[PDB]
Amino acid sequence: AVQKVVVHPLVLLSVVDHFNRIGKVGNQKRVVGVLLGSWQKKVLDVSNSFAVPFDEDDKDDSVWFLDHDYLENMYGMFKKVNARERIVGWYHTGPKLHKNDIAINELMKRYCPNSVLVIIDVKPKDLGLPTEAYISVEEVHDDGTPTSKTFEHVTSEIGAEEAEEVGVEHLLRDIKDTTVGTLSQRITNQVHGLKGLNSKLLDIRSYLEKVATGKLPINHQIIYQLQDVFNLLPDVSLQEFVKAFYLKTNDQMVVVYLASLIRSVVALHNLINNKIANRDAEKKEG
Amino acid sequence: LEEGKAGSGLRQYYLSKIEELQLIVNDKSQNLRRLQAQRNELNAKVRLL
Amino acid sequence: DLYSRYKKLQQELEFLEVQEEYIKDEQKNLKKEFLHAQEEVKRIQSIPLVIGQ
Amino acid sequence: MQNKQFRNKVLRVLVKIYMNLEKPDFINVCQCLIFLDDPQAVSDILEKLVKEDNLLMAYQICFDLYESASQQFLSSVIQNLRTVGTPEPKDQTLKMIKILSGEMAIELHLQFLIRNNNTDLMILKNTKDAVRNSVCHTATVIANSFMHCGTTSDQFLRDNLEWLARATNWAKFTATASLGVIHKGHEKEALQLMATYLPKDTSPGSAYQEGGGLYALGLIHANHGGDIIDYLLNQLKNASNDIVRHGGSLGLGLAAMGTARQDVYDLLKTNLYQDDAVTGEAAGLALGLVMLGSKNAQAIEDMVGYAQETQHEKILRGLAVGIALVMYGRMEEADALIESLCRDKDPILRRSGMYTVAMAYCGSGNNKAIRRLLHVAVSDVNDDVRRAAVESLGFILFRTPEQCPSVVSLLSESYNPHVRYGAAMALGICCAGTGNKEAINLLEPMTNDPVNYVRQGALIASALIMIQQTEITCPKVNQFRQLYSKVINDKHDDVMAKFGAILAQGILDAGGHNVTISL
Amino acid sequence: AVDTAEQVYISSLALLKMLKHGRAGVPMEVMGLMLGEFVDDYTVRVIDVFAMPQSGTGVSVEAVDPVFQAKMLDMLKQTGRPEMVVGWYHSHPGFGCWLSGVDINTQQSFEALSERAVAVVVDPIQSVKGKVVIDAFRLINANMMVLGHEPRQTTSNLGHLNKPSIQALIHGLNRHYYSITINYRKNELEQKMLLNLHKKSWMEGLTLQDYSEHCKHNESVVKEMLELAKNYNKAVEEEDKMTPEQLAIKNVGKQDPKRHLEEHVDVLMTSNIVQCLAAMLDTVVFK
Ligand SMILES: [Zn+2]
């Protein structure tokens, strides 16, 4: 159905507000809010949202608390002031996916249309993309397991419409734009290695552990395709790619010629002025 | 003796060569701070813009 | 004062040496601020507009 | 540029040569005692005063040792000298009594300053012409406080009562404080004159008179042994809100400076426990003064723990200056603390680290600080730490006035005007009291700018130089004329421009050229 | 008769909500409310900010429904937002950010409760995207006309309040009218979160995706751009052939505004992409 979605920073900043108004409780469990957007267009667009109280139980995990009246009131007034946005789905700040979440989402699965689930972290220590869009659909399982709600990963992007970019850029005055050049590119070319390093290290360890040491048949079948992807590159000897390396290095030579020639052109005015201005200043000095 | 007017002398002249190296540091700092003042002048110009 | 000139000059040496990393910081940062302000006044210009004479 | 690891031992082993000679020398023992600050170094020479049996030679060393260059060392040596002797018997008593007196100097200074006064009507007339009822109202009375300091003359303010109390504002507080600046060193006539104003119902409509009286009292009794502090506690015990807390913290905090008492610390804590920003800022200013040299262990963690838990900026800057001024001789100690607090998110605390490392590294003993000072000056986008940057630089480089304008020459014209302002303050404090023209010839581009901040800073910087200088040696005519044009240009300039202008003019006319400043 | 120095604290919450209110800033008159908590007299903080439904009457004291107001406020009280209303905000598109008669009248009516009553007017329509800077408004008393206008200390921030440097509206409407300074607040949480989110917004999901794409597009797309670059550079060089004549004639003064240098430098900067992505391709090929 939906190929990709658009998530604005405003809702995550509303989560920052959720971490703001806490006021030192001593509980700070997962808080379920109500996300709003436009389900009319194929691509999902998030504008703004509100917050609803959500509480659970220590021992029993099947306990979930929502409000129909508050939801209908907030959505009612929001629809009253703005008719260009309606209900879509919900989201939680919990780093882990609870089993009760299917029952929590079941409500909006009944009353509302199909809802999208978003998982974020309470502490922004994650370098990767904090927002993961998960569509709720029923898929046929190959192993023959009974049909249940399955969360499928949907690609997403973080962007703003018009004024939000200005607001962010003004409030920050730190981050820099694309700015094609040396430092902007080389920073990426440096840190990206760590971007892959910490992620892969955080992944393959728990992967290796849970595969051999673990149970609850999450359908490992896709991981054979994972390993297959890892085997899609059987150590190519580059012998066929030698010509490509030759063309690339030829382009490098072109870069060399361009650089040398252009710099040689720039050196003109400098290696003229450095003489003609100095000799004239010196002779007219006294 | 032949030290203070010899060894200490060539030591002071070695210090003069050090003053030459620090003269290189000096005028390098000079032209670098002049280029700095130039870039700051252009930045102040677009600031006026 | 002859032999004191050395030890007295060392302070000036260190003082002139400490300015290196300083002018490094200035020249590396102020160009980034330069392109920053450059793109700031560049983004001011927009395609939609009115044509006069 | 010694690290003090050797030089102190070198001097303390070099003070044994002159005691074996025919006569002692005051210059070397003074220069050493103001350096190593060792109690055992003065231990022999204090008890040799009786052995030598010479009164005239002891007066000099006693006077110049008790005059300056120590606080807790003096507080220790006074009781150390109090212990020595009876709890020439009759001569030693009057000697040991008179040497720690210090009131004589205040007497002769107040006297010669009373008889040297020379005033002109043109200046005061100009101030009364350029005065406004809002902004420069405080500038006029602070200028009056500047010129009337030491002469104890209230006759200039006895002209009219409608030039002061005509409106209710902080201007009356600054006026009373200005009066406190006018007269100093009075254990009787001060409180007497303050109580002579309205001793009727003992209930003034304006509390700024009482609070300002407390602040003035703190200004007068500062660094004295005649402290009324014992009474000031019960006077602070009175029931009020704005003036007792704030003015009391300022006055009592300034009066208790150097005492390092735990009582004033406790009451200051219970004064800052109300979470209020203003009285907590005054509490910070007072705490920084009274805790100097004490260096309490849990105080730092308590204050930095009290820092991020409040959103008010006043309490933040209050604790900032509080932890800034309290740090002395920590050069070999607090490095890790400053380095740890340098990475803090708070801009106020970031400036607080620089203000803290400022006075600690003074004397140009560390070249490491200026690295991160200039680094955080250029790199950081916030103008706060940038305008707070070169103050510490000027503080540590204050030794050589010539080298400063060269390295601040790039900060003469900066990107943001705040850096130009801080640099103006830098050229102001570094070239202060000196004859360096490197700032002076560069004052001409600084005196005219589209921004008013850098202009005002240039006025202050120009005010801190021309003071105590001969006109025949250097052509100051230009800057004097451009400074005298500021009052006639006030109509075509900014409201704060004329403020900083007359404020800059109050510097040269201060004390009638008699009193000056020295770093 | 006492007046201190007040400063309005503005967070990212109210800012972004006023940006959404900026998208809601259509010529149709709109209403808004601001909430917060007063710790003392000289400081004011705003946290909860929402919008209001549009009406045909426009902005008026009658437009505000008291029962609906108190209702929503109660709904905020039962939730985790225990803050009283600190005032109200609105938009004044295209006729200027100033206040009309009805506006100052309903302001006079709404300031009967709160002595402060912070007034904020946002007008993104004629406001360039270069600066989002906004100026908060205040209301002077009518009985202060005899005495001085503004008895406020801390005059150092007036230069920061000098941002509205327009030579008309300021000293034109200065009679019985004035403004107040604006500052922001940021902690480590918001800083790190928003910085990471924005950096990720300018980055990819796995971050290794669209890099190798351009790396392999260097031999297809960039090449044509390099050819065009050589075309423009040659178009400069043909004039550069004419330049040494002028350098052999005048040499005094510059009649050519064209720098001819920094642009070619930027061309080299675009040419360095191949070199920078070369090592990238090396890392991809290696492991
Ligand atoms: Zn209208």
Tab-separated table of C-alpha atoms in Angstrom, chain D residues 114-265:
chain	number	residue	atom	x	y	z
D	114	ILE	CA	39.872	66.703	51.598
D	115	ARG	CA	42.290	69.586	51.008
D	116	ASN	CA	43.301	68.832	47.397
D	117	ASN	CA	39.815	69.181	45.902
D	118	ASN	CA	39.464	71.287	42.754
D	119	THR	CA	36.129	71.453	40.930
D	120	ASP	CA	34.748	73.164	37.826
D	121	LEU	CA	31.202	74.370	37.142
D	122	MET	CA	31.281	73.557	33.419
D	123	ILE	CA	31.270	69.786	33.955
D	124	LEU	CA	28.404	69.675	36.460
D	125	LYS	CA	26.446	72.182	34.370
D	126	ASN	CA	26.956	69.932	31.351
D	127	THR	CA	25.715	66.947	33.356
D	128	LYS	CA	22.626	68.872	34.463
D	129	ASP	CA	22.062	69.841	30.825
D	130	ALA	CA	22.429	66.327	29.408
D	131	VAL	CA	20.559	64.580	32.234
D	132	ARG	CA	17.469	62.450	31.576
D	133	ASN	CA	14.901	61.039	34.007
D	134	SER	CA	15.224	57.435	32.828
D	135	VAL	CA	18.542	56.152	31.478
D	136	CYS	CA	21.439	58.514	32.206
D	137	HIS	CA	19.940	59.534	35.557
D	138	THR	CA	22.150	56.861	37.117
D	139	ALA	CA	25.100	57.944	34.972
D	140	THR	CA	24.935	61.473	36.369
D	141	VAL	CA	24.896	60.346	40.000
D	142	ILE	CA	27.586	57.716	39.420
D	143	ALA	CA	29.686	60.430	37.774
D	144	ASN	CA	29.019	62.598	40.814
D	145	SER	CA	30.062	59.651	42.972
D	146	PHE	CA	33.220	59.393	40.877
D	147	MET	CA	34.191	63.059	41.214
D	148	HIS	CA	33.072	63.489	44.838
D	149	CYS	CA	34.736	60.307	46.101
D	150	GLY	CA	37.080	60.951	49.019
D	151	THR	CA	36.050	64.567	49.585
D	152	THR	CA	32.935	63.480	51.511
D	153	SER	CA	31.022	66.457	50.104
D	154	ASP	CA	27.236	66.101	50.083
D	155	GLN	CA	26.871	69.836	49.439
D	156	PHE	CA	26.579	69.160	45.709
D	157	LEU	CA	23.542	66.991	46.435
D	158	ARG	CA	22.222	69.480	48.996
D	159	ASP	CA	21.210	71.820	46.168
D	160	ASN	CA	17.775	70.289	45.554
D	161	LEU	CA	15.748	67.296	46.738
D	162	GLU	CA	13.665	67.331	43.553
D	163	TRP	CA	16.581	66.032	41.482
D	164	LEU	CA	16.535	62.709	43.341
D	165	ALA	CA	13.265	61.656	44.978
D	166	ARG	CA	11.059	63.144	42.240
D	167	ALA	CA	10.437	59.608	40.959
D	168	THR	CA	10.512	56.138	42.513
D	169	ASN	CA	13.016	53.785	40.872
D	170	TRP	CA	16.381	52.048	41.278
D	171	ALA	CA	17.914	55.441	40.488
D	172	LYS	CA	17.398	56.429	44.126
D	173	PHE	CA	19.168	53.242	45.201
D	174	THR	CA	22.091	54.021	42.902
D	175	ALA	CA	22.002	57.577	44.260
D	176	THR	CA	22.239	56.428	47.877
D	177	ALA	CA	24.996	54.029	46.849
D	178	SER	CA	26.632	56.964	45.066
D	179	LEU	CA	26.476	58.855	48.356
D	180	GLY	CA	28.155	55.805	49.858
D	181	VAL	CA	30.898	56.225	47.270
D	182	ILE	CA	31.252	59.922	48.129
D	183	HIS	CA	32.081	59.456	51.819
D	184	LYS	CA	34.183	56.559	53.109
D	185	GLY	CA	35.956	55.584	56.329
D	186	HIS	CA	33.371	56.841	58.810
D	187	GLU	CA	32.501	54.761	61.876
D	188	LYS	CA	30.110	57.387	63.247
D	189	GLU	CA	29.186	60.218	60.871
D	190	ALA	CA	28.185	57.684	58.207
D	191	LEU	CA	25.405	55.878	60.070
D	192	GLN	CA	24.671	59.231	61.709
D	193	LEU	CA	24.124	60.999	58.382
D	194	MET	CA	22.116	58.030	57.103
D	195	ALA	CA	19.875	58.145	60.179
D	196	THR	CA	19.597	61.946	60.115
D	197	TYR	CA	17.410	61.901	56.996
D	198	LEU	CA	14.136	60.590	58.434
D	199	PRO	CA	14.340	59.670	62.146
D	200	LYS	CA	10.650	60.352	62.815
D	201	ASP	CA	8.277	57.415	62.354
D	202	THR	CA	11.140	55.076	61.395
D	203	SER	CA	8.998	53.983	58.439
D	204	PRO	CA	10.198	55.436	55.107
D	205	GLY	CA	8.043	55.093	51.996
D	206	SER	CA	11.127	54.119	50.013
D	207	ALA	CA	13.071	51.116	51.302
D	208	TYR	CA	15.797	51.820	48.736
D	209	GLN	CA	17.144	54.370	51.214
D	210	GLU	CA	17.586	51.718	53.906
D	211	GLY	CA	18.920	49.047	51.558
D	212	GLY	CA	21.151	51.608	49.888
D	213	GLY	CA	22.266	52.637	53.356
D	214	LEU	CA	23.241	49.041	54.061
D	215	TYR	CA	25.095	48.782	50.750
D	216	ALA	CA	26.843	52.083	51.468
D	217	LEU	CA	27.707	50.829	54.951
D	218	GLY	CA	29.218	47.748	53.337
D	219	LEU	CA	31.223	49.987	51.017
D	220	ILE	CA	32.524	52.080	53.915
D	221	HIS	CA	33.327	49.323	56.415
D	222	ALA	CA	34.868	47.032	53.788
D	223	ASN	CA	38.327	45.711	54.723
D	224	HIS	CA	38.200	47.340	58.165
D	225	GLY	CA	38.635	46.081	61.724
D	226	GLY	CA	35.853	48.332	62.968
D	227	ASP	CA	33.190	46.106	61.411
D	228	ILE	CA	29.618	46.593	62.634
D	229	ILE	CA	28.895	43.059	61.366
D	230	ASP	CA	27.815	41.841	64.818
D	231	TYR	CA	25.042	44.441	64.680
D	232	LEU	CA	24.542	43.830	60.952
D	233	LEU	CA	23.341	40.302	61.716
D	234	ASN	CA	20.522	41.556	63.945
D	235	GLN	CA	19.865	44.358	61.462
D	236	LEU	CA	19.515	41.744	58.722
D	237	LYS	CA	17.256	39.811	61.096
D	238	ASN	CA	14.638	42.507	60.442
D	239	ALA	CA	11.461	41.690	58.515
D	240	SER	CA	11.460	42.815	54.882
D	241	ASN	CA	11.680	41.518	51.317
D	242	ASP	CA	13.679	43.330	48.633
D	243	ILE	CA	16.217	45.487	50.473
D	244	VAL	CA	17.193	43.361	53.492
D	245	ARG	CA	17.934	40.235	51.455
D	246	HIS	CA	19.718	41.906	48.536
D	247	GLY	CA	21.277	45.005	50.088
D	248	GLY	CA	22.028	42.988	53.203
D	249	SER	CA	23.765	40.256	51.223
D	250	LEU	CA	25.825	42.863	49.369
D	251	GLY	CA	26.750	44.984	52.385
D	252	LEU	CA	27.331	42.224	54.927
D	253	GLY	CA	28.990	40.091	52.260
D	254	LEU	CA	31.417	42.875	51.399
D	255	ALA	CA	32.044	43.636	55.075
D	256	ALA	CA	32.695	39.987	55.948
D	257	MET	CA	35.123	39.546	53.048
D	258	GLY	CA	38.351	37.881	54.160
D	259	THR	CA	36.890	36.629	57.435
D	260	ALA	CA	35.984	33.205	56.008
D	261	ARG	CA	33.283	32.617	58.626
D	262	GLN	CA	30.992	29.582	58.489
D	263	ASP	CA	28.141	31.588	60.024
D	264	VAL	CA	27.859	34.082	57.169
D	265	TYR	CA	28.127	31.053	54.876
